[PDB]
Design a protein around this ligand. Structure first.
Ligand SMILES: CCCCCCCC/C=C\CCCCCCCC(=O)O[C@@H](COC(=O)CCCCCCCCCCCCCCC)COP(=O)([O-])OCC[N+](C)(C)C
Ligand SMILES: CCCCCCCC/C=C\CCCCCCCC(=O)O[C@@H](COC(=O)CCCCCCCCCCCCCCC)COP(=O)([O-])OCC[N+](C)(C)C
Ligand SMILES: CCCCCCCC/C=C\CCCCCCCC(=O)O[C@@H](COC(=O)CCCCCCCCCCCCCCC)COP(=O)([O-])OCC[N+](C)(C)C
Ligand SMILES: Clc1ccc([C@H]2C[C@@H]3CC[C@H]2N3)cn1
Lengths: 375, 375, 375, 375, 375
């Protein structure tokens, strides 16, 4: 009875076009805040933050006022989109194909004219995502809100601290905080300044999954590439091991090409580890080729340079703690004996080249080890 | 004739803004339930439950009442969106880009004013999906509904048991149950409390497909990695087998990277099996390198430590139940004979190193076997 | 002139809320059919059938009647959405995020009041897709239509045979038929029953592409895995061949993981062939390891069990149709001669182990062959 | 002043429901054409053509006429959706989830009543895409337009040649032409016939990218598979080369599985080349196994069939232009000498088997070469 | 008070259909510019530029004028969509499924009637993307705006320089500039010309990420393929190395198939490097097969052509700075001695073929090196 009467009286001559101030020369104060409910998604490749947010807007409407003695029990009223003046506050840096993602709900007005408006929405905002320090990276995503067509002379936007009481923690992003800052800006469009409120959502990535999926595979690849230096050359498998470890690395590069977020803005420090490991694997293949040249050296070819015969077989080697008819028959047997004694000599020469390969092989083992550590 | 007359009389002075109570100071009771029809999708990566649901809302409208003797045959009427007051009940934890997924249908009103409203819809809700015990995991997805702008003083939400009579079983998720609980909450926005009804959909994953696609490949990989310990060293293929099994493991890691749902919140126990198998494969490659060092040992290098000559060739070995001119011609032949007798000695020394490799090879076979069992 | 006059007269006092019957106590008959134009997509993973359909609804409207002598030439009229009463017939088992996919068109009404309404639309419906017999699988997808808010007492839904004259054959699904069945159901919501019409679209998959992309690769993999039993052991490549065939199998498992539709409801019989082939490949690798143990057996180790010396070298082998100073010099030469005669003996022992490997190798060839056939 | 007056006079009693003809018994002529601006996408897998098109509709409206002496300067007027009668022309074979993709713009009307209406839109149409001759394939995609609810007695659709002056060439599809044909069809719905205009867009694929990404890899794979026949058997790598070439082929099959469009309707002739190359690779692996059996033949096993000793070592070989105490000491030395003379004989027998392998190896080289050519 | 009065007076007799000019014969000038805020995405495969833009339109409305002495404090007013005449300026080359992506906001009008309208929007435009010089490629994407239904006689479009003060730099595309050009075009539709304003957005790709992900892998592949020429032939692994490097190349071709943008219009010069590297790898495999034929040559087969014995062993080799009873016993020993002396001769012949392989091996090393440089 009284709710009906009030609803009929309130709209008499009301104009949703009119900014509802008593004095036209004065600006209308609008308090703007928001409630952060959940960080739905952080799109690194598209540079888009998705959030579930309840916007909070409050203003006084001069015309929507009533004495609650003449309408007993009617302490508030509600108006849908289009029947009440509302601030046209938009998210400036929206990434939504519709640009305005707010779901339009009721404005709640009490008897002194105070208008409350809390539209929810899944908001997409354009956020510059810096993955230089990925996975230990902190992102500052700005949410810039402001009246689109009401400037500072007409709509005095004011900020209130963002609400996080209802926040639901994300399983990948730790909410550091959501500070806000009201600014008064000028635009080439207009001589009048347009205030805005910007909420910076500071997020801290929880790195566990990434440290478990991206870093241990590099240690296992590097380790399996460094086992080539322990594999004997007689096996005939050093190249198989090293080249197959590199093929596995390439497959893991496909995986990394998917798991790791790339935005092309910088060079994630983490990727200097992927590079260190690809270079250690390729250089262990190059050094396995050098060791194989040493091991398979031709005994009838060149002679081992005295230079290397002392650099490796002596110095490095020590540092590694490594160590008539009767006469006709005589000529026939002597040939055989000397043939034997000559292949034996060639086998000894071969044994030094085979030994040098072992020494070079272990030196590379230790050298490659320390290099991994520092990197 | 009477349907027309009733439809004309009912809207006379009706106001869809008015909460349709007789006494304004009193709250309006709204019974809220839902019918679960189908669980369409459980998005683990986006943390979104998709369901086909029929919402059920019922209230009494004081103005929509008629005597069915003055309108014979007209026992009910129907009103579309915008011509009747309706509760503004939303899904709070919506993940829909539109936020309100309900398809708006007719409100059915009978002659005493009872309003029934069963809007259908494909509802997306944000659900925390815990895959710690995947594939034997149970998910509790909350559906929180409540009036957006009507608080507890105006709209007394009441719950009724959810309907599952029409449910269609999912081929991947067993519906344990959908209990509900009405709560009365406070929000920083407002001093008035806002009741809500929350339906918790408890689902139990049917693990067959996952146990068939993800677990047997790990047993086949582990088994093929443990066949390296039975492959003879003379073959010259132990490294080829082990390293290729690891390459196949990496490809299977791509597959697992797709089939398995990862949400980065925890560490699926199942993944401790993927880790156990990758470690068994890498350690069988390391132990194959050690066996190859033993087998390919240089007979003219070091001597087999008595320590190991007893630890392996004796103890482990037993535990495994393993086992003038004429004189010038004489000198020539003696050299040849002694050369033979010296290579033979070196061949025997080599045979112990080749034997030790076999013993170490089988010990690793049994050791690796028991390790798999416990893990 | 007459079209204008008729359009003005027809809407005078018309109410799109009124079910357009003359007697209010009687139900309104609505004939419902559809024209199937094209089966756009069969989503096995999401369990969604997409179709292009023209719905067909016909009823009589008591008020939309005119004498075509007073409006010469005006034999029909057309009304858009919102200006005429229309049945609210929805697809119950919709999978569309909007839930109602019908494109709203004109209702065509002739002079006796007969209303025709053929809205087109791209309809998504939830269909249980059973791939047990994939690719020779037949799917029965239900399309359940019914009035949402008009029960059997108000709207007497009646069915007419579906139209397929305009159907455009799909390149992957053969339309067996689209039978319909009108049912009268009860729901927990309501004591009144709600009739519905359900069209079951029966589809038969055209299996060519699948038989060409999924089955021949398994025959080629199995064949290349069985060529290991013909490869000699001296080559030193049996393991390379078998393990690389298994790696190729894993890559083909990625392909199958994409081409093959999996819905987790059952276990496609076809997949018992994928399992048979993976098991034949892994068991040919295990049997190649056994053959290699036989071939590389140590002549100074154990002795070939008489048991196997008769089981293989005799029985299986036959079944396969397989087959002073002078004296000092004497001692020196005798040693050499006996050394030769002793390695020769050891070479013969080795030749039986090498022979046994060949016999086991071919037995496995034939055994593995018959196993493939039956599977 | 005059524009305002005309706009007020024109809508007086206007009815957007009225087909705007002077005589009601007569049909209204509507000229229909379109401007093709760009072929946006040809979806082979979903069988959907996407185009940017400007529809062109023209008709005369009897009521929208004015004398341009009483409204000086006002030579045309414009009306938005809903304030003027418009033809309800739809794309019958739409693949758009909304079914009507036209963006609704102004109708331009001049002083004699001629209505022009050029709505733009991104149109999705269902097109049967035949990839039998891919990449040299020509597609005929139909665009069927017609009035949905106005039959031939009410709306006389007429065609005009499609406009391509503004067309922007596609980088993948050459526009052969867009002929049109007006048809008068009957439907089971209705006894009245419904005319339609169908524009067939004929496209010719520009095959460069496909010939560069899909065909050369098959020539390189086939060539690398045929280098196995030139690799010596002593290398011990023929199987490694052939089986790894097949593994690379499988990876390339993944690539082809993505680049190549498959619609399951036919069997792209191009794919007979993919099959020819997979079969040449598998058969070169089979023939490498046969060559290896020849090369590794056991000298103490069977004897080379005279049959093959003449077929290969002679005929094919020629066609390829290929080619007391003292006595005790005597017995000891004679044994050694005869042992030598016996292994030598066995080495010669081995050399024929090794020679035969070379002859078979080259015959397969030439045979496989000619086979590639014809295929 | 005055805002209300003005809003009531301004709409009295206003007609949003009327182009708001004082003289009807004259055209209305509309200034059109835009503010570029962010280049959201450059879709090379779909040929679509996505941008966040604020359109800027300004015109004078003759009717929306008031004296600001009779409405003190009211210096501007605002009108939403549908209550004021607005230019119907569309993006001609839109790629949006809705075709008009502009979010409709208020028109701001001051007291002399000047209308300002700055609708924001996420605009999709069809842009021809030329990747011939990728990654050092510059794209010119046109944005063609114009009145759809107002020709040059009614709406005199005029251009103003685009605004970039608010631009936010993209992490992948450097904004060179956004020049504009107003054109007056004719269309087959209409005899009247339709002016348009086209803004060409010139972008310069920042190539770092691409040079790091696509080019270094080709240098590492080419280098690992050229290490086969340093690997000794005795290792028995040249083919394993080369063929596995090619397999890794194929995997990298999958990666390139994803990272690299292909539009099929041209042939990216960069891809001539991918071709150079695939050809160097395949030709090093072919030359490794030739070297293996040389190394494994049969000493009892043909003789080394004098031609090659001088071309390689001399010329190239030098350029590379590379280098009774008693008598019966005599016959027995002589045989053995001569057998030895004959295998030795055959070993020397083999050593020249093994030497020639080394010379050919290094020549190919240097030849392949210079070829890489030039390419
Ligand atoms: C730490 C190593 C370098 C690392 C950095 C990479 C640098 C380049 C890589 C490897 C370089 C390795 C050194 C060269 C090989 C040694 C050959 C030699 O000693 O003599 C040979 C010279 O043969 C040549 O011409 C060698 C120089 C050509 C190298 C070209 C690089 C190709 C690999 C690219 C791979 C890039 C790496 C991939 C990265 C992921 C022959 O001579 P000799 O017969 O031995 O001499 C005795 C003869 N005498 C008795 C008659 C006197
Ligand atoms: C052109 C070839 C066929 C091509 C078409 C494919 C057909 C099938 C493929 C290959 C067949 C190749 C011919 C058989 C091998 C020769 C063996 C032989 O000669 O004798 C052996 C017989 O051993 C057998 O039992 C051979 C028959 C079994 C073949 C089963 C096919 C498995 C491979 C599936 C791969 C499928 C292909 C993959 C396609 C991508 C043993 O006898 P022997 O000791 O040599 O004889 C002398 C002994 N004597 C002195 C006591 C008398
Ligand atoms: C620079 C090389 C070419 C490069 C371009 C590619 C061209 C083609 C590739 C390679 C060609 C390499 C040359 C041929 C091999 C040498 C054989 C030879 O000398 O004699 C053999 C002839 O055997 C033949 O029939 C050889 C010709 C067939 C080649 C077919 C190409 C297959 C590979 C496709 C791969 C494509 C490449 C892949 C590209 C990524 C046998 O004769 P001989 O016993 O040695 O002679 C002495 C006997 N005598 C004593 C009785 C007199
Ligand atoms: Cl007002 C109203 C809405 C929906 C219904 C339900 C009864 C049948 C089954 C679902 C729906 N149609 C009943 N009444």
């Amino acid at each position: 009875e009284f709710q009906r009467k009030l609803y009929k009286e309130l709209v008499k001559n009301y104009n949703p076009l009119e900014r509802p101030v008593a004095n036209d020369s004065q600006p209308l104060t609008v308090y703007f805040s928001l409630s952060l409910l959940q960080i739905m998604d952080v799109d690194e490749k598209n540079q888009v933050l998705t959030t579930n947010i309840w916007l909070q807007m409050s203003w006084t409407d001069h015309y929507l006022q009533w004495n609650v003695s003449e309408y007993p029990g009617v302490k508030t009223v509600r108006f849908p989109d289009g029947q009440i003046w509302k601030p046209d506050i938009l998210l400036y840096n929206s990434a939504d194909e519709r640009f305005d993602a707010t779901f339009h709900t009721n404005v709640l007005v009490n008897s002194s004219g105070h208008c409350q408006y809390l539209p929810p929405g899944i908001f997409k905002s354009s956020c510059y995502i810096d993955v230089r320090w990925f996975p230990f990276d902190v992102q500052h995503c700005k949410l810039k809100f402001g009246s689109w067509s009401y400037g500072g002379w007409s709509l005095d936007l004011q900020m209130q601290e963002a609400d996080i009481s209802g926040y639901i923690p994300n399983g990948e992003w730790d909410l550091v905080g959501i500070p806000g800052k009201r600014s008064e800006r000028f635009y080439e469009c207009c001589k009048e300044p347009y205030p805005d409120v910007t909420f910076t959502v500071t997020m801290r990535r929880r790195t566990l999954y990434y440290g478990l999926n991206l870093l241990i595979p590099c240690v296992l690849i590097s380790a399996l590439a460094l086992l080539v230096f322990l594999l004997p050359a007689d096996s005939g498998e050093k190249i198989s091991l090293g080249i197959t470890v590199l093929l596995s690395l390439t497959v893991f590069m496909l995986l990394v090409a998917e798991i790791m977020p790339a935005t092309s803005d910088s060079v994630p420090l983490i990727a200097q580890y992927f590079a260190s490991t690809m270079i250690i694997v390729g250089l262990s293949v190059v050094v396995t080729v050098i060791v194989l040249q040493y091991h398979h050296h031709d005994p009838d070819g060149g002679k081992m340079p005295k230079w290397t015969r002392v650099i490796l077989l002596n110095w490095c080697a020590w540092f590694l703690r490594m160590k008539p008819d009767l006469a006709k028959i005589l000529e026939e047997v002597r040939y055989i004996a000397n043939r034997f004694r000559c292949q034996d000599e060639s086998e000894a020469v071969c044994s030094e080249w085979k030994f040098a390969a072992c020494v070079v092989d272990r030196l590379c083992l230790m050298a490659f080890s320390v290099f991994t550590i520092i990197c």
